[PDB]
Amino acid sequence: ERTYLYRGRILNLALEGRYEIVEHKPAVAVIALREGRMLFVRQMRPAVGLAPLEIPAGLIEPGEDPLEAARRELAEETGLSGDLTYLFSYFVSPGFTDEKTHVFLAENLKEVEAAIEVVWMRPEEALERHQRGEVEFSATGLVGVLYYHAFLR
Amino acid sequence: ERTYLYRGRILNLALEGRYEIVEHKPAVAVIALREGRMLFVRQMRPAVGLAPLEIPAGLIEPGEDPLEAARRELAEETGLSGDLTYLFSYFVSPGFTDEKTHVFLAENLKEVEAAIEVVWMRPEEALERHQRGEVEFSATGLVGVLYYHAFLR
Ligand SMILES: Nc1ncnc2c1ncn2[C@@H]1O[C@H](COP(=O)(O)OP(=O)(O)OC[C@H]2O[C@H](O)[C@H](O)[C@@H]2O)[C@@H](O)[C@H]1O
Ligand SMILES: Nc1ncnc2c1ncn2[C@@H]1O[C@H](COP(=O)(O)OP(=O)(O)OC[C@H]2O[C@H](O)[C@H](O)[C@@H]2O)[C@@H](O)[C@H]1O
Ligand SMILES: [Mn+2]
Ligand SMILES: [Mn+2]
Ligand SMILES: [Mn+2]
Ligand SMILES: [Mn+2]
Ligand SMILES: [Mn+2]
Ligand SMILES: [Mn+2]
Numbered sequence: 001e002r003t004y005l006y007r008g009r010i011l012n013l014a015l016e017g018r019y020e021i022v023e024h025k026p027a028v029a030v031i032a033l034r035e036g037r038m039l040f041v042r043q044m045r046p047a048v049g050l051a052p053l054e055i056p057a058g059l060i061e062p063g064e065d066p067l068e069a070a071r072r073e074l075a076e077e078t079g080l081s082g083d084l085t086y087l088f089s090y091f092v093s094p095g096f097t098d099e100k101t102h103v104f105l106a107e108n109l110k111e112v113e114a115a116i117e118v119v120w121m122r123p124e125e126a127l128e129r130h131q132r133g134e135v136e137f138s139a140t141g142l143v144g145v146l147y148y149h150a151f152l153r
Numbered sequence: 154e155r156t157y158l159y160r161g162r163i164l165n166l167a168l169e170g171r172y173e174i175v176e177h178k179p180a181v182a183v184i185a186l187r188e189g190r191m192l193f194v195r196q197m198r199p200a201v202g203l204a205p206l207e208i209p210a211g212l213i214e215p216g217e218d219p220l221e222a223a224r225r226e227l228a229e230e231t232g233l234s235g236d237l238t239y240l241f242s243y244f245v246s247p248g249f250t251d252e253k254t255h256v257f258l259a260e261n262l263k264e265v266e267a268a269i270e271v272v273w274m275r276p277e278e279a280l281e282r283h284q285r286g287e288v289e290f291s292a293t294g295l296v297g298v299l300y301y302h303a304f305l306r
Contacts, residue, residue, distance in 0.1 A: 010173055090292045
């Protein structure tokens with residue numbers, strides 16, 4: 001049984017016996033390569049007090065499925081559309097939250113539309129800047145970089 | 154300025170203006186290969202109501218640095234010790250929490266010690282079971298699988 005301590009906009013906090021649980025909407029993230037650059041985004045993230053390197057990502061809204069949310073986030077954050085393929089999903093931190101992220105690949109990007117900074121960057125370069133302490137990653141940014149190195153070279 | 158709504162054992166819930174923020178201890182995770190198998194673990198995770206495929210992981214305790222926490226978690230969860238190398242870090246979900254995960258590689262594993270299920274499994278097989286819907290991943294499990302495919306074949 002869950003007891004709710006807080007019902008919010010983007011999360012709920014519950015207790016389930018001794019466990020502290022944060023309920024959170026599911027998310028999507030989009031991996032996109034063009035001319036050897038990966039599409040990263042950065043924005044201020046008050047939770048961490050900095051702007052980590054992320055890939056385009058967002059919450060799934062009411063009525064939407066993951067593919068539709070992925071299309072919307074890509075367009076809203078970067079002005080692009082592409083051919084989207086589902087890759088895999090993961091729980092961001094299942095020791096305390098149910099947030100699940102669905103990850104897509106986007107191909108054949110086109111500008112559909114001309115706060116969030118678009119940062120095209122070679123993944124090799126993102127990984128080197130991170131190893132040197134120059135940038136932090138979100139899980140989505142790291143998953144994009146590792147996926148590229150595994151499968152897209 | 155943060156306003157605190159809840160101060161807990163493994164998180165705090167705060168408001169920072171319009172943002173809902175969950176403070177959380179930093180974590181470590183350990184990627185380990187032996188004879189082509191990756192060291193996964195599974196445990197029931199009440200937040201998600203299932204046991205996703207993870208790698209050995211845990212919270213950094215008071216007094217510890219990430220390397221020490223990684224050594225401890227590996228031993229406590231799997232009875233093993235190894236030669237540990239720092240790889241990279243990521244924020245699990247920086248749109249709402251400050252949880253940061255430090256990821257290590259372990260080599261030359263040895264049994265130091267004879268709830269958490271140890272699951273040695275080829276990463277190729279973990280990825281195929283996940284694509285087929287048979288298992289879910291945590292971020293740490295997916296990062297382990299992608300890192301292997303990128304760098305350890
Ligand atoms: N939700 C909870 N609330 C209260 N206490 C808990 C909770 N979960 C576990 N405990 C207690 O806290 C102790 C913590 O066990 P350790 O191995 O250091 O951590 P980990 O594996 O949980 O988390 C490691 C990362 O992996 C996952 O992605 C997580 O989300 C983290 O990001 C447990 O024995 C319980 O006593
Ligand atoms: N902590 C917050 N609390 C309140 N509202 C917020 C918060 N953060 C953003 N908003 C509002 O909610 C809207 C959400 O913007 P969208 O693009 O769909 O989501 P995303 O990119 O934030 O999160 C995507 C994933 O990436 C990260 O890993 C996250 O942790 C997620 O896992 C914002 O415009 C704000 O109005
Ligand atoms: Mn977003
Ligand atoms: Mn957005
Ligand atoms: Mn912009
Ligand atoms: Mn653990
Ligand atoms: Mn443990
Ligand atoms: Mn066990």
